[PDB]
Amino acid sequence: SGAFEDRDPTQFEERHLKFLQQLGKGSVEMCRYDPLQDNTGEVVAVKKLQHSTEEHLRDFEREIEILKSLQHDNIVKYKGVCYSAGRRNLKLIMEYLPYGSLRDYLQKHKERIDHIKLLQYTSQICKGMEYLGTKRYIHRDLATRNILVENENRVKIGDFGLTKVLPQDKEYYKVKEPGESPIFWYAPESLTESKFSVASDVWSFGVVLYELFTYIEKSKSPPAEFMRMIGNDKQGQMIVFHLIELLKNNGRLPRPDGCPDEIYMIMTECWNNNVNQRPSFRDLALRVDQIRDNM
Ligand SMILES: O=C(Nc1nccc2[nH]c(-c3c(Cl)cccc3Cl)nc12)C1CC1
Secondary structure (H helix, E strand, O other): OOOOOOOOOOEOOHHHEEEEEEEEOOEEEEEEEOOOOOOOOEEEEEEEOOOOOHHHHHHHHHHHHHHHOOOOOOEOOEEEEEOHHHHOOOEEEEEOOOOOEHHHHHHHOHHHOOHHHHHHHHHHHHHHHHHHHHOOEEOOOOOHHHEEEEEOOEEEEOOOOOOEEOOOOOOOEEOOOOOOOOHHHOOHHHHHHOEEOHHHHHHHHHHHHHHHHOOOOHHHOHHHHHHHHHOOOOOOHHHHHHHHHHHHOOOOOOOOOOOOHHHHHHHHHHOOOOHHHOOOHHHHHHHHHHHHHOO
């Protein structure tokens, strides 16, 4: 009955997006996009909300804009949007990464992980973060659970739902928000003052590096280790009070078993209370690639 002109490959048609699997609960599904009706098509990941409140939808739209603005080998690829429920709902379309989160990959695929691989992932994470800096984006949620694995040789930063954009003349973003924070990845100034910056991303990167070198041994996770240092029985605000006091006076995650001193030195430089003395992501990428190249 109708003629058709497609001038926007970023608009995925609801009727052609076919369910493959539930990936985790926002919630993410794996789907097949099959406009040619032939039982094939590209496999994609689809992110949807739980509640489309004026607030959550505005945030979701901002996350979509953020992801769309990014094009880099070490950042999850934006593919498009689907305006489902007859154009009364919104879903984000992105590339599907077969190995899932780095946290899970390290846990489930120890057979294929050595220090060479760990430094390769470290390098790629720094380069993705360098790229975010050029956009003046502050991620605020760097952790191995939020980094995704394409294959043995490539990891990508995901999870842009907390990302903030710095105005031209500003060097930090103060954000007070209700609910739970990933406190064991937070820099001291984020804990005490809700201040986020490239330098606070560098602090969190230090924790990521720690996570890599612990191989996600369940007992060695940042929450497990900090809670052991703080006291395992502590609950609620008391945890935060003790974490802050600990960090302000140089309490730090321990060197993981089998971690070279030079790699631990990188973590400890990231974990500087003095914001301005933390290294840049460019400094880190160079140092890590030089370590890699010098063997
Ligand atoms: O889930 C998989 N791959 C994935 N591909 C593409 C995008 C993906 N986003 C996630 C994801 C999930 Cl479900 C929960 C929390 C945090 C993240 Cl970052 N996972 C994604 C593989 C394991 C089946």
